[PDB]
Amino acid sequence: YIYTQ
Amino acid sequence: RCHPHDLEALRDFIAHLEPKPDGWINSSSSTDCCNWTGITCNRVIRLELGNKKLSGKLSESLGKLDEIRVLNLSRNFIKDSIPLSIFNLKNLQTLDLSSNDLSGGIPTSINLPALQSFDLSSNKFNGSLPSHICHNSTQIRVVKLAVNYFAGNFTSGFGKCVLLEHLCLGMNDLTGNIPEDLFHLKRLNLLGIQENRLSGSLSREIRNLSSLVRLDVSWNLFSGEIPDVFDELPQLKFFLGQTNGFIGGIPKSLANSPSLNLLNLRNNSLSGRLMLNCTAMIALNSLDLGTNRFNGRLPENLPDCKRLKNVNLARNTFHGQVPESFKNFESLSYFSLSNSSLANISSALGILQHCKNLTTLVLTLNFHGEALPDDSSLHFEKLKVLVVANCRLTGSMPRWLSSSNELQLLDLSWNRLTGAIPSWIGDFKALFYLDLSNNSFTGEIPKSLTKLESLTSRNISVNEPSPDFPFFMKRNESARALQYNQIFGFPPTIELGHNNLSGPIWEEFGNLKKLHVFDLKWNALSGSIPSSLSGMTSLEALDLSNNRLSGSIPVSLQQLSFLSKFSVAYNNLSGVIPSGGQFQTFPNSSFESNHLCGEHRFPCS
Amino acid sequence: ANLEGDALHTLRVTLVDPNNVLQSWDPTLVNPCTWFHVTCNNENSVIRVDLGNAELSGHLVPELGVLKNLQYLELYSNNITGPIPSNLGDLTNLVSLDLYLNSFSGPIPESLGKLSKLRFLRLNNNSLTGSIPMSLTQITTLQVLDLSNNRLSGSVPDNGSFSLFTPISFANNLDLCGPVTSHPCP
Ligand SMILES: *[C@@H]1O[C@H](CO)[C@@H](O[C@@H]2O[C@H](CO)[C@@H](O)[C@H](O)[C@H]2NC(C)=O)[C@H](O)[C@H]1NC(C)=O
Ligand SMILES: *[C@@H]1O[C@H](CO)[C@@H](O)[C@H](O)[C@H]1NC(C)=O
Ligand SMILES: *[C@@H]1O[C@H](CO)[C@@H](O)[C@H](O)[C@H]1NC(C)=O
Ligand SMILES: *[C@@H]1O[C@H](CO)[C@@H](O)[C@H](O)[C@H]1NC(C)=O
Ligand SMILES: *[C@@H]1O[C@H](CO)[C@@H](O)[C@H](O)[C@H]1NC(C)=O
Ligand SMILES: *[C@@H]1O[C@H](CO)[C@@H](O)[C@H](O)[C@H]1NC(C)=O
Ligand SMILES: *[C@@H]1O[C@H](CO)[C@@H](O)[C@H](O)[C@H]1NC(C)=O
Ligand SMILES: *[C@@H]1O[C@H](CO)[C@@H](O)[C@H](O)[C@H]1NC(C)=O
Ligand SMILES: *[C@@H]1O[C@H](CO)[C@@H](O)[C@H](O)[C@H]1NC(C)=O
Ligand SMILES: *[C@@H]1O[C@H](CO)[C@@H](O)[C@H](O)[C@H]1NC(C)=O
Numbered sequence A: 001y002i003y004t005q
Numbered sequence B: 001r002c003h004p005h006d007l008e009a010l011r012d013f014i015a016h017l018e019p020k021p022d023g024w025i026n027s028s029s030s031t032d033c034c035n036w037t038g039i040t041c042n043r044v045i046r047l048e049l050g051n052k053k054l055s056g057k058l059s060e061s062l063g064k065l066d067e068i069r070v071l072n073l074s075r076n077f078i079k080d081s082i083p084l085s086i087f088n089l090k091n092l093q094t095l096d097l098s099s100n101d102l103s104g105g106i107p108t109s110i111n112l113p114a115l116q117s118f119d120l121s122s123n124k125f126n127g128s129l130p131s132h133i134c135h136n137s138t139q140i141r142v143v144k145l146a147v148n149y150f151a152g153n154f155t156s157g158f159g160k161c162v163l164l165e166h167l168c169l170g171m172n173d174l175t176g177n178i179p180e181d182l183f184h185l186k187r188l189n190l191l192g193i194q195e196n197r198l199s200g201s202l203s204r205e206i207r208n209l210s211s212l213v214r215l216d217v218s219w220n221l222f223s224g225e226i227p228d229v230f231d232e233l234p235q236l237k238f239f240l241g242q243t244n245g246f247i248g249g250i251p252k253s254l255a256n257s258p259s260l261n262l263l264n265l266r267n268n269s270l271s272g273r274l275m276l277n278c279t280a281m282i283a284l285n286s287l288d289l290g291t292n293r294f295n296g297r298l299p300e301n302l303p304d305c306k307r308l309k310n311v312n313l314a315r316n317t318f319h320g321q322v323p324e325s326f327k328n329f330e331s332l333s334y335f336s337l338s339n340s341s342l343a344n345i346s347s348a349l350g351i352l353q354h355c356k357n358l359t360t361l362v363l364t365l366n367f368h369g370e371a372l373p374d375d376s377s378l379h380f381e382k383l384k385v386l387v388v389a390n391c392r393l394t395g396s397m398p399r400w401l402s403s404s405n406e407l408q409l410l411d412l413s414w415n416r417l418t419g420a421i422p423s424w425i426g427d428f429k430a431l432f433y434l435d436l437s438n439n440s441f442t443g444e445i446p447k448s449l450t451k452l453e454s455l456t457s458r459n460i461s462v463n464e465p466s467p468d469f470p471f472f473m474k475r476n477e478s479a480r481a482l483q484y485n486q487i488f489g490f491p492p493t494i495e496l497g498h499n500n501l502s503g504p505i506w507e508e509f510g511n512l513k514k515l516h517v518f519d520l521k522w523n524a525l526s527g528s529i530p531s532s533l534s535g536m537t538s539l540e541a542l543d544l545s546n547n548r549l550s551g552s553i554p555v556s557l558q559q560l561s562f563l564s565k566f567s568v569a570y571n572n573l574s575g576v577i578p579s580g581g582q583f584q585t586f587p588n589s590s591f592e593s594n595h596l597c598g599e600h601r602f603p604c605s
Numbered sequence C: 001a002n003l004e005g006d007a008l009h010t011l012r013v014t015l016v017d018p019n020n021v022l023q024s025w026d027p028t029l030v031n032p033c034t035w036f037h038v039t040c041n042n043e044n045s046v047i048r049v050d051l052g053n054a055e056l057s058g059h060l061v062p063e064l065g066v067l068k069n070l071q072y073l074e075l076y077s078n079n080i081t082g083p084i085p086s087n088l089g090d091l092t093n094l095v096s097l098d099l100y101l102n103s104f105s106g107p108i109p110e111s112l113g114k115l116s117k118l119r120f121l122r123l124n125n126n127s128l129t130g131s132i133p134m135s136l137t138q139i140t141t142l143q144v145l146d147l148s149n150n151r152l153s154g155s156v157p158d159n160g161s162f163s164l165f166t167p168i169s170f171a172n173n174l175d176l177c178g179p180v181t182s183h184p185c186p
Helices: B004-015 B060-064 B084-088 B180-184 B204-208 B324-328 B345-352 B399-403 B423-427 B447-451 B507-511 B531-535 B555-559 C002-014 C062-066 C086-090 C110-114 C160-164
Strands: B046-048 B055-057 B070-072 B077-080 B094-096 B117-119 B142-144 B149-153 B166-168 B173-175 B190-192 B214-216 B221-225 B238-240 B245-248 B262-264 B269-273 B286-288 B293-296 B310-312 B334-336 B360-362 B385-387 B394-396 B409-411 B416-418 B433-435 B471-473 B482-484 B493-495 B517-519 B541-543 B565-567 B572-576 B595-597 C038-040 C046-050 C072-074 C096-098 C103-106 C120-122 C127-130 C144-146 C151-155 C175-177
Touching (some): B004 B060, B180 B204, B324 B345, B423 B447, B447 B507, B507 B531, B531 B555, C002 C046, C002 C062, C086 C110
Parallel strands (some): B046 B070, B055 B077, B070 B094, B094 B117, B117 B142, B142 B166, B166 B190, B190 B214, B214 B238, B221 B245, B238 B262, B245 B269, B262 B286, B269 B293, B286 B310, B310 B334, B360 B385, B385 B409, B394 B416, B409 B433, B433 B493, B493 B517, B517 B541, B541 B565, B572 B595, C046 C072, C072 C096, C096 C120, C120 C144, C127 C151
16 A cells, blocks of 8 residues: 555 | 877877767877867866766876866766876866766865865765865865765864855765854855764754755754754755654744745654744745654644645644645645544545645545545546555545546555446546555456556656655555655556455456556456456566466466566466466466466476 | 665666666665566565566676676566676576577676576577586576577586486587587587
C-alpha cells in the first residue's frame, strides 16, 4: 500500500 | 595559429584522454588550437570540455597554460589525481572538475589569486577540507565540495573568505558542529551542509549570516531547539533541516517570516501545538512537518496562508476532523496526512472537494473503520493522485471518483470494500497505477480494464503532478519500504489481488502493451490463462497464484522477456512447465500445488 | 546500495538505449531498488537484472562485479558488443548468466569457474573465440550450458560437470574438438 511520511 | 607553448600543453592534455572530440582529431598536425572544440583565446584563456565522455587522467601540462582563466572539465570520466601546477595558475578564476572520478586529496599550499569559483563536487576526494584556499584566493565567491569523501571536523577557515556567497559541503562525512568562524560570512547566501554527521545545537549566531537565502542543514545529527533567529534573516527562502533531532515548537520568528517559501523539518522531534502566523508568512508555499510529535487538532489557520501549495503533516500525532476552514485552501495542490488519527472521512472529503487546485491527496492510515462516502455529490475535478489505503474502510467503489477524469494513480488497497469493481474504472484515460488489492470485491473483473488508454498506446500524454513530498510503498508490513520521489516513478500497475473475484481473465488483457505489474493472486478466477497474455510485452511481474484456473500455461509466455516475477502456484493447471526464455529463473514455488510437469523440477508419471 | 546503484549507472551510460528501458535508472536515489528491470532483495541488494530482448547495444562494464549478491543476469537478445568482463567471476552468487543472442567478442573469461553456484550458462549466438575454460568443470551446480554458434576452438572438456552435455551445446564452432563434437582432436 502507498503511504506518506 | 596559437602559441607554441599552449599548443604543446593542449597536446599533452588530450594525449591522456579519449576520445578526442570534434575537433581534436588533427591535434598532432595542426596549429589551429583556437578553433578546436572548447578552446578560446584572445594565448588559450578558456578550456571547456564538460560532458564529452572524456576518459583518462589530468595531464601535468594543464598547469602550463599560464593564461587560462576558465578550466571546465565537469561531467566526464577522469580518474586519478589533480596535478599540483593546476593549484598555481595565477589567472584561473573558474575551476570546475565536478562529476568525474577524481581522487586523492587537496594540497596544503594553493595559490589561485584570481579564483572566483571552485567546484570539485561529485568526485572521490579524500581528507581534510581545502579551507586554506581563502588565504591566497581572496576573491572567491563559490566553494563546492559536495558529494565527496571529505571526513573529519568541519574545520575553521572559510571565515577568511570575506566575499564567499555559496558554500556547499553536502553529502560528505563531516563531524563536529558548525565552526564559529563561518558566522563572519556577511555575504553568504547559500549554505549546504546536509547529509553529513554534524552534531550539536544549531547556534544562534546563524543570525549573523544575514544574507542567507537558502540554508540546508538536513540529514545530520543536530539537536536542541531551532534557534529563534529569523527576523535577522530577511532574505531566507528555504530552510531545510529534515532528519535531525530538533526539539520544541516552531519559534515565533520562523512562524512570522514573510520571505520563507519552503520549510522542511520533517523527521525531527518537534512537539506541542503547531502555530504559524499565516498573516505574516505571505510567501510560504511548501510546508513539510511530517513525522513529528505535534499534537492537537490540525491547525485551523493554514488556509490563511494564501500561497501554501504543498502541505505535508503526515505521521504526527494530530487527531480529529479536518478543520472546517480548509474549504478555503485556495492554493493547495498536494496534501498528505497519512497516519494522523484523522476522523470523519465523510466530512474530510466533503470539505477538501472545495479546494479546486487539489491534485494529490494521501490519507493512508486514517479514519480507521469508517465508511467510504457513497455520496455522488462530491466532485474532485483536478484530482490526479488519490491514495486512501489501509483505513479498513467499508462500502463500495465511490461513484463520485468517476468524474475525476485526470486520475493517474489510485490506491484504495487494504480496506474492507465490497461489491464489484465498476466498469467506469476503465474510463480513466490517464490511469496507469491501480491498486484495489486486499479488499472484498466480488463479481467479474470489468472488461474496461483491458481498454485503459494509458496502458495500451505508448503515446498518451499527460502532465505528472509535482508534490515536494515523496511517496513510500510497502508490499507487506514487514517489507522494507521503497521510496518514490516521482509519480511517474511508479511502475504501471494493475493490482486486484486478495479480493473475492470470479470470472475469466479476459484475452483482451493482451492489449495492455505497457503494463509492468499484473497482480490477480488470491481471488477465485477460473478458465484458462489466455495465450494472448504474451501481448503484454512490458510485463515485469505476473502473479496469478491462488485461483481456480485450468488448462496449461501458454507456451507463448516465454516471449515475455522482462518478466522477473511470476507465479501460478495453487491453481488447477496441468501440462508442462515451459522452459527457457525467462522461465528457468522462476523459483520452484512459482509452480507448486498444481498438476504441472517439469524436466528438472516436478517430475511426472 | 548507493555503490550498487553507481555500478549500474555506469552500465547504463555505457549502454545504448533507443527504447528508453533504462529511463527510470535514476542515480540520485539511495539505491536502484525502484528501477524498472532491477530486482532487489529484503536487504536492498540487487539480485536480478532482467534486460533480455530490450534492444540494447554498446558494451558491458567491469563495474558489474560490484553487485555482490547478483543471482540472475539476463541480457540475452540484444546487440551488446565488446568482451565479457572477467569481473563477472566475482559475482559468486550468480545462478544465471544469460548473454546469448548478442555480439560479444574475445574469450570466455577463466574467472567464470569461480561461479560455484551457477546452474545456467548460456553464451550461444555470439562471436566468442578461444578455448573453453577448464575451470568451468569445477562448477558442481551447472545444469544448462549453451556455447553453440560461436567461433570457439580446442578440446572440449568431458570431466566434472561437463559429462552431462551433448553436441547441441557446442555445435557450430570454428574448430572445436572432442567426442562431443563432429571432429576428433588432433
Ligand atoms: C528519520 O530519522 C531517523 C533517525 O535519524 C532515520 O533513521 C536512521 O537511518 C539511518 C540510515 O537509513 C540508519 O543508519 C540509522 O541507524 C537510523 N537511525 C535510527 C536512530 O534509527 C530515518 O531513516 C529517517 N527516515 C526518513 C524517511 O527520513
Ligand atoms: C562547465 O560546463 C558544464 C557543462 O558544459 C556547464 O553546465 C557548467 O555550467 C560549467 N561550469 C561552470 C562553473 O561554468
Ligand atoms: C599562498 O601562497 C604562498 C606562496 O605565494 C604559499 O606558500 C602558501 O602556501 C599559499 N597559501 C596557502 C595557505 O595555501
Ligand atoms: C501575526 O502577523 C501579523 C502581521 O505580521 C501581526 O500584525 C499580528 O499581530 C501577528 N500576531 C501574532 C500573535 O504573531
Ligand atoms: C504510523 O504511525 C504510527 C504511530 O506512531 C507508527 O507506529 C507507524 O510506524 C506509522 N506507520 C507508517 C506506515 O507511517
Ligand atoms: C461527521 O462530521 C459532520 C460535520 O462536522 C457531522 O455532521 C457528522 O454527524 C459527523 N459524522 C460522525 C458520525 O461523526
Ligand atoms: C489486508 O489489510 C489488513 C489491514 O486492513 C491487514 O491486516 C492484512 O494483513 C492485509 N492482508 C494482506 C494479505 O495484505
Ligand atoms: C472471500 O469472500 C467471502 C465473502 O465475503 C468471504 O467469506 C471469504 O472469507 C473471502 N476469502 C478470501 C480468500 O479473501
Ligand atoms: C527445486 O526443485 C529441485 C528438484 O526437485 C531441487 O533440486 C531444488 O532443491 C528445489 N529447490 C528448493 C527451493 O528446494
Ligand atoms: C543462432 O545462430 C545460428 C548460426 O549462426 C543461426 O542459424 C540461428 O538462426 C541462430 N538462432 C537464433 C535463435 O537466432
